[PDB]
Amino acid sequence: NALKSDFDSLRDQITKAASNAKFNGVSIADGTTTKLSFLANSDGSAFTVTAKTL
Amino acid sequence: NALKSDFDSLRDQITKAASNAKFNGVSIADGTTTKLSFLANSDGSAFTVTAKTL
């Protein structure tokens, strides 16, 4: 049960560390969105970046 | 009787040491409070530390 409590503290600290990762309110790895569509060229074409949930 | 007297002296020093473990007026081990809390991030989420009375 001591190793169980260790495993639980590890797993929920991972939830904390993943949830707190964001820049100006958006995150590529929180799983809130499937992608972010960053600008690429003057005509409006975007540099797609697929999200990787952590 | 000598052994029970040393036994009482031991259990009394245990009460002393358990009651003297305090930091800036707060203790996680004294048993005065069910838990203690600390900041996790900028928005005010807590990092709870469950008390373990000694």
Swiss-Prot record, chains A, B:
It is found in: Secreted; Bacterial flagellum. It comes from the Bacteria. Flagellin is the subunit protein which polymerizes to form the filaments of bacterial flagella. Belongs to the bacterial flagellin family. In C.crescentus, the flagellar filament is composed of multiple flagellins of 29 kDa; 27 kDa and 25 kDa. This is Flagellin FljM. It comes from Caulobacter vibrioides (strain ATCC 19089 / CIP 103742 / CB 15) (Caulobacter crescentus). The gene is fljM.
